[PDB]
Amino acid sequence: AFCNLRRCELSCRSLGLLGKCIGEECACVPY
User: Fold this and answer.
1) Positive/negative CA dihedral, 16, 17, 18, 23
2) CB-based contacts of 20: which residues, under 8 Å, 6+ apart?
3) Any stretches that span the bilayer, and where are they?
4) Which of 6, 23, 26, 27 is deepest in the core (most CB within 10 A)?
5) In which domain, by residue range, is 25 found?
């Protein structure tokens, strides 16, 4: 399945940062 980059951005917003798709899975990272 593909990256739901929207739900990743929501999940990482609680941590104060972005939630980018890398190798078809999300990771939280700075701006």
Assistant:
1) negative
2) 5, 8, 26, 27, 29
3) none
4) 26
5) 1-31
Q: How many domains does the chain have?
A: 1
Q: Which residue stretches of 1-31 are H helix? A: 5-13
- Where is 18: in which H helix or E strand? strand 18-22
Burial class (CB in 10 A: 0-12, 13-18, 19+), 19: buried
**Amino acid, single-letter form, for residue 23:** G
The gap from C-alpha 3 to its chain's centroid, in whole angstroms, comes to 9
Give the technique used to solve this structure. NMR
